[PDB]
Design a protein around this ligand. Structure first.
Ligand code: HEM
Ligand code: HEM
Ligand code: 3XA
Ligand code: 3XA
Ligand code: H4B
Ligand code: H4B
Ligand code: ZN
Lengths: 407, 411
């Protein structure tokens, strides 16, 4: 019932009790671990509402106060009559911060309590959504001094009136299948790009075309909007030693902003809740640039470095990998766009785990995602045992909307 | 029931049925995943079903399930258990059992090799001197002058838990560690405690940075005894770098033969508490973990200094840069001395092919992603993108507590 996690580099042992408050299922059993699998009514709503309000009122040190019992009877009355309920601003803010706090796959959670919440629950149309989104982008970007933000659109009602951002991130590049048989741009985005073109988009057909937003309000058909280019901060990628690096034609955007998840607070479901922070360098330099099914640039870079590509054991892939990632961090730092390296992020996350163990009795964490995709064991998180469990409020995955939308 | 795993790079989807034969528990539940936790005297009653399950598997593997030979073997084992409380494996069953413990080792990336394993039967061994001799022979056979061959030596099984054979070393070959009065460590800090035990037992320590430890060997539950492996049997590689001539002057070397000696082999309910096995190294084990862990030789600073890297900011990636050069050096050195080694690209690619074959021929392949993914350059190896299912099959290799913690000293 009390569980220990050990750090094998430092011998520090922490005790987890927070897991007992865990509610949802991991996908594992006593017979099988699914730790590396990517995706493992009024009667339902009231326990959910109650559990959330109990944790909310405890956090403000007013558990079992009149204010507490009053809010419970009020929501109870509201659910019993209207089948849903509305969160107070204070509850919404608390719920959003905590869904981030509980995000077991997020290495950047030391920042959890510094999150600007934009309440967009009064939004009714796709143009409205676009206005809210541009304002989030500009606020978060802050001319390169990035600030964490979330914008929260109206909650699910009967499920036929969902608000959704169709994009997976607010800012991503287009992907095009070619007569050649190769892919131009980002291969991850081929299908979404096609959906955009078929809905009317004027694709430039370049390597790095910022995708239009495709916004769905009130369960209506989604609409296209082009984010003002002056609000999309981009970084030209150069290397501090290799003058040729710039000729590769590489750039990335400054603002990572996940826009396809579901925020669940007190049993209420917010199907459109784009959120953003700032990058850890490896996301761009390891995953975006070097994944084989992504920009897949290792071959090109190694060739420019004139490495021996004849045998895997020369570690040419590894060598070029480091260089690419050096370039990403240098370019961002030189243009004064907030970025964190994997060393510094993982060190902060260990500090955050310790604070969470001390102040909350634990920190749910998914080792498979926390450990960076390069140089695993030379970061402290590699040697840190982590317990993975699901707490609410939460961010959840949801089916891509085109699979489900009735046109 | 069917479980699917996907590769997110290739979109190859596989179906696991083998997890249905899985017995033991993972440590995980529906409410918690303990996938990153390092560590999450039987009865006749419990023994015959374990024997039976094993023998059914063995006899199916040879296409003789339900044969007279199969039935007679079940009867003979059943009778042996009721009469003596235990039983003895036939040579053939031992070999099969040891091969399958390796096949089932979900944390091992090298399992493509599982069916090529030399099994040395040391169940007639009675003394620590006998153990030493068996172990010298395994080391010489496995080393094979650099052309490494996988082997396991199997000492007598547990009886009452009071007469255990144990090898006290965690690996047959490892370097001593020495805690200094000023708090620094000379040699391998991982082996400080074991080194102290060796010294107490009477080892004369050379007190250098790479002193091969003696074997400390326990036969039949007796107090363990010290033996020096003949140095001519211990193949070592001095580490140099193909382009950087100053690399040799760090004075690094490592041994060629990785040989785990502290695990317990379970076959059909029998427990082999001393079963040293060896294969060959994947480069990163040395270049990343042994050399670069903060709690090990910790050479990153000194290497990056000599490379004149910008060390004032982590964001220069000086650590990542020196790390790659160190690992190039290890691979170069072994290859130049014709000592078998595999790089992490080649090893992981081979593992994926092994895994897919296993799904097709066996209905699954239990695999622990946390351990399978190499400790550098994770996502440019194909295993990073491979979903895996971790579950426990027998025969198996298991951890056991260090023996100095449990041993009853006789004097
Ligand atoms: C402030 C800087 C932040 C950093 C450096 C950071 C870091 C990261 C990284 C590296 C990942 C893994 C992503 C991947 O590999 O695809 C991640 C995942 C995630 N983060 Fe953060 N994060 C930050 C801010 C935020 C914010 C503001 C939120 C929400 C309010 C958030 C919630 C999440 C969630 C839910 C995931 C899992 C996403 C998924 O499952 O695909 N993070 N974080
Ligand atoms: C033939 C070449 C082999 C290679 C390249 C190889 C590779 C590896 C590696 C890299 C690990 C993880 C080591 C660590 O991080 O401590 C490992 C673990 C393991 N391997 Fe192998 N292996 C080989 C042969 C063998 C053999 C012959 C056996 C037994 C017959 C074996 C059984 C195991 C077991 C039981 C583990 C988990 C050890 C633990 O939990 O500490 N492997 N293997
Ligand atoms: C807010 C924030 C800050 C930050 N630094 N980084 C982020 C993650 C973003 C950026 N860089 C990757 C992207 O993360 C979004 C991608 N998440 C995983 C997936 F959606 F691709 C996915 C696909 C299929 C199955 C599955 F389980 C998950 C968010
Ligand atoms: C046979 C074989 C071949 C090969 N290439 N490699 C090997 C593993 C060896 C070599 N290189 C590392 C070492 O493995 C032994 C170190 N593993 C970790 C541990 F087992 F010691 C351990 C520590 C703490 C808790 C726990 F549960 C386990 C064996
Ligand atoms: C199969 C495996 O679960 C999958 O490749 C995961 C591994 N770890 C990850 N870690 C992060 N941070 N992001 C990812 O997309 C993944 N992919
Ligand atoms: C806490 C964590 O599980 C621990 O550091 C593991 C991670 N992965 C590993 N993987 C391998 N191959 N060897 C190890 O020792 C470890 N250590
Ligand atoms: Zn699990």
């Amino acid at each position: 019932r009390f569980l220990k996690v050990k750090n094998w580099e430092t011998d520090v042992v922490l005790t987890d009790t927070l897991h007992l408050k865990s509610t949802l299922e991991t996908g594992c059993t006593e017979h099988i671990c699914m730790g590396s699998i990517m995706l493992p009514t009024k009667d339902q709503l009231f326990p959910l509402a109650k559990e959330f309000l109990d944790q909310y009122y405890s956090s403000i040190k007013r558990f079992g106060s009149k204010a507490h019992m009053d809010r419970l009877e009020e929501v109870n009355k509201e659910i019993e009559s209207t089948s849903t309920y509305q969160l107070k601003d204070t509850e919404l803010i608390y719920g959003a911060k905590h869904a981030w706090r509980n995000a077991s796959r997020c290495v950047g959670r030391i920042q959890w309590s510094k999150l600007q919440v934009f309440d967009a629950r009064d939004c009714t149309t796709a143009h409205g959504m676009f206005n809210y989104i541009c304002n989030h982008v500009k606020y978060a970007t802050n001319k390169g001094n990035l600030r964490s933000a979330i914008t929260i659109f109206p909650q699910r009602t009967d499920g036929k009136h969902d608000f959704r951002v169709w994009n997976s991130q607010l800012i991503r590049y287009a992907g095009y299948k070619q007569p050649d048989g190769s892919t131009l741009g980002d291969p991850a985005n081929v299908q979404f790009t096609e959906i955009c073109i078929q809905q009317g988009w004027k694709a430039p057909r370049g390597r790095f075309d910022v995708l239009p937003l495709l916004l769905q309000a009130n369960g209506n058909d989604p609409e296209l909007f082009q984010i003002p280019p002056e609000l999309v901060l981009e970084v030209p990628i150069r290397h501090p030693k290799f003058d040729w690096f710039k000729d590769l034609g590489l750039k990335w955007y400054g603002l990572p902003a996940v826009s396809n998840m579901l925020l669940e607070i007190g049993g209420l479901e917010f199907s459109a809740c784009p959120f953003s922070g700032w990058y850890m360098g490896t996301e761009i330099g390891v995953r975006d640039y070097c994944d084989n099914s992504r920009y897949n640039i290792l071959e090109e870079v190694a060739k420019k470095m004139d490495l021996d590509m004849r045998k895997t054991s020369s570690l040419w892939k590894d060598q070029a990998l480091v260089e690419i990632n050096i370039a990403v961090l240098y370019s961002f730092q030189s243009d004064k766009v907030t970025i964190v390296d994997h060393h510094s992020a993982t060190e902060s996350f260990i500090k955050h785990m310790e604070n969470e163990y001390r102040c909350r009795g634990g920190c749910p964490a998914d080792w498979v995602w926390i450990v960076p995709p390069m140089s695993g064991s030379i970061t402290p998180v590699f040697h840190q045992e982590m317990l993975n469990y699901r707490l609410t409020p939460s961010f959840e995955y949801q089916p891509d909307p085109w699979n489900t939308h009735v046109w």
